[PDB]
Structure 1
Amino acid sequence: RFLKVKNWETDVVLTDTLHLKSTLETGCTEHICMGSIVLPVRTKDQLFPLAKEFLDQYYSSIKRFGSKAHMDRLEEVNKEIESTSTYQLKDTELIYGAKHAWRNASRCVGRIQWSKLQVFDARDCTTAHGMFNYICNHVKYATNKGNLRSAITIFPQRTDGKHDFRVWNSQLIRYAGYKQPDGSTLGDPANVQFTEICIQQGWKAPRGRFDVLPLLLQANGNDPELFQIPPELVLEVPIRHPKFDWFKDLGLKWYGLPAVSNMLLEIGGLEFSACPFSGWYMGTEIGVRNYCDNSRYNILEEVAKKMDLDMRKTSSLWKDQALVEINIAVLYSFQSDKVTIVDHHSATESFIKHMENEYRCRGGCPADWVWIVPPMSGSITPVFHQEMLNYRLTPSFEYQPDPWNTHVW
């Protein structure tokens, strides 16, 4: 019932009590652990307990638990559900809901920042053109000329589920992917299917390695439409190395703003299916995953060749050498251009501090070790040595089906 987690590097032990509030299921059982698995409307009756549970935590957080304003609010929501079959969040509840969805994201190493999130209320939005305007303003505000600020923009909540707002893109800013007659792939292979839906919806693709995708915005369950983010709002960094002069000849660049736009935000049983949110990069996301994944840009082979390393035996660790340098270059490039970026030592150090705060201040912190530990130098970052408990709290961000599997035309 009361659980301990130990850090094996510091011997510091923490007691978790927050897990007993978890509602949703993990994928695991007593018989099987699904820890490494990437992926393991409401009626009037389902919605009300959800609303109450949420409002209860809200009013407790503002130290007004059991007060007349608490009781009255519970009344008003119940009455709205009974007659309208849904309800509207107050601004204050919405800000709180969003922030706690981030506080609760067990896969996010950057949650020390959870309270500093700028919430843009876009529930008055009605069209795709409106969505586009909200998005460009988010993108510009968050970017802040390279001094990035965390933000989320929240579109209208789901109704009967035939009137969903969706950003089709997986991030507001991503690069196209094209399959070539050559049999290979130019650009980001992670994006082929989506790039094809952009060309099939009308986009003129420049057919480059780094083509910023057009936004595919769906309002009120309507057919999605294309828009191009003003190029001057897309801050990109050319990638160079502080010692290797030849590194820039690789042609590499990345965008400054990581902004996830395909997730579904659940607050008090209400479902916000379009809720693009953004912060700033940890270096490894680009240098390790985007650049070096075999299924991504896959440049290790080419980089190692430029450093003149022995690629005949895996045991020369040429991959590992090239990986370090690629990641040095990413960090250096973002820093030289004054675009906020955090390295994995710094991020994990910070997440450790954040865990300790969440344990004393909340009695816990759901954390997913498989995602928290960076994809390089795992054991030299402190999160490696830290036991974590993983459980699902609400409010939350969740994955949801790609809209094209779902929405018909």
Structure 2
Amino acid sequence: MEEKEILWNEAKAFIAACYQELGKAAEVKDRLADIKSEIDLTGSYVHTKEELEHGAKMAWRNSNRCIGRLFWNSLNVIDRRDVRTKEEVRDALFHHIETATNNGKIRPTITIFPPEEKGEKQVEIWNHQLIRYAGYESDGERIGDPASCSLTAACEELGWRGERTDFDLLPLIFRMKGDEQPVWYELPRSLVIEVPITHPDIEAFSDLELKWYGVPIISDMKLEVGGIHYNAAPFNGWYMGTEIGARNLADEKRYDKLKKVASVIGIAADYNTDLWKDQALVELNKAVLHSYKKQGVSIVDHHTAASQFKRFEEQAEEAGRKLTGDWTWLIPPISPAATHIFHRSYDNSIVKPNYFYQDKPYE
């Protein structure tokens, strides 16, 4: 064994750790044997519902780049390893969107599909997030979100067509084992909450006609638990405001709105020493938090989020767990020195279970 030996070692490590945390310590030997025989028989093994749930939660806890980890143990885990058809996959994805959105009171949720077998995917999801805007470039200038340009082009190869507004919802797109091409389904608009961006004090701000979607649902990462590869396992939290105001709407390679923001808030955008970009960033970011709160859609500001992560740190030390983190992702892109994160270091070691990048099926 080499491939199956890797599986065995990962399973031994995970089960011990998992059962210890669950207090099931005395059950480890028996479970480990059953697993051993099941690998010898089938070349793999199946997680119990408890192992899967706790595995997914552990994976979140170990995600070095995530500032929202305080709430790892409250992850809502939906077990969909039973799906076999594209209608079932589609309906599970619609359901995830609905139950996670929860009328605006967002629930951190993951839906878990059948894992790879021989490195053979059962389900291959093409979307980066379940809800995202399309992007086009035939230059009347760019249209929409440039980060979606390649996926948008692939969808349109498959017969979909966007309206070419700056906010076209992409369809869900995924491929089933045995099919050469993926399928796509348009998102029901009643499922997707969107928030118009207004400013608490500046009436002109609505003239920008900005909006964003309520729930970021990452759908392109692999969840690995105990040597088992769940390549299809979409998860969501709620947004930190800076992700929208400082990146999605502000980056030059994304929506690039800072100059327009400066104009509506009535400052000149001519001199670096005026810090007009910094000023525009703050008002935009204030508008985002205000708009989400007014609509009743969950969101966290970067200061509150950092305070929560300080508690995660304290909780980790208190439970004897080593803390891991990626300082470059944990600091907010706005006023990072105003948070405690900026003034300490973190160990960027990779602990499993965890979420990992995988190759895109397209481009």
Which interval holds the TM-score relative to the shorter structure? over 0.9
Quote the residue 1:301 is aligned against: 259
SS of the residue 1:119 aligns to: strand
Quote the residue 1:168 is aligned against: 126
Quote the residue 2:111 is aligned against: 153
Residue number among 257, 261, 268 corresponding to 1:310 in the alignment: 268
Detail structure 1 runs of 4+ shifted over 6 Å in the superposition.
none
One-letter identity of the residue aligned with 2:149 = V
SS of the residue 1:243 aligns to: coil
Deviations 1:354-390 (A, max 9, x none): 1111112133211111100000101012211122211
Quote the residue 1:60 is aligned against: 20
One-letter identity of the residue aligned with 1:397 = Y
Quote the residue 1:186 is aligned against: 143
Deviations 1:26-45 (A, max 9, x none): xxxxxxxxxxxxxxxx7212
Distance in 2 between residues matched to 1:161 and 1:64, nearest whole Å: 31
Coordinate RMSD, CA, aligned? 1.2
Q: What is the aligned length? A: 361
One-letter identity of the residue aligned with 2:186 = Q
Quote the residue 1:364 is aligned against: 322
Distance in 2 between residues matched to 1:242 and 1:148, nearest whole Å: 23
Equivalent residues in 2 for 1:10-409 (5 A)? Answer: 43-65=3-25, 67=26, 69-182=27-140, 184-220=141-177, 222=179, 223-404=181-362
Deviations 1:379-402 (A, max 9, x none): 012211122211100000000010
Distance in 2 between residues matched to 1:78 and 1:221, nearest whole Å: 30
How does the TM-score come out when normalised to structure 1? Answer: 0.86
CA shift, 1:221, in A, is: 5.2
Whether the aligned pair in 1 keeps the contact of 2:205 and 2:265 (CA below 8 Å) is no
Gapped runs of 5+ residues in structure 1?
1-41
How does the TM-score come out when normalised to structure 2? Answer: 0.97
Whether the aligned pair in 1 keeps the contact of 2:154 and 2:362 (CA below 8 Å) is no
Quote the residue 1:6 is aligned against: none
One-letter identity of the residue aligned with 2:280 = A
Quote the residue 1:18 is aligned against: none
One-letter identity of the residue aligned with 2:105 = N
Distance in 2 between residues matched to 1:162 and 1:277, nearest whole Å: 21
Whether the aligned pair in 1 keeps the contact of 2:127 and 2:172 (CA below 8 Å) is yes
CA shift, 1:311, in A, is: 2.2
CA shift, 1:305, in A, is: 1.8
CA shift, 1:281, in A, is: 0.3
Distance in 2 between residues matched to 1:250 and 1:312, nearest whole Å: 20
Distance in 1 between residues matched to 2:197 and 2:178, nearest whole Å: 40
Whether the aligned pair in 1 keeps the contact of 2:219 and 2:235 (CA below 8 Å) is yes
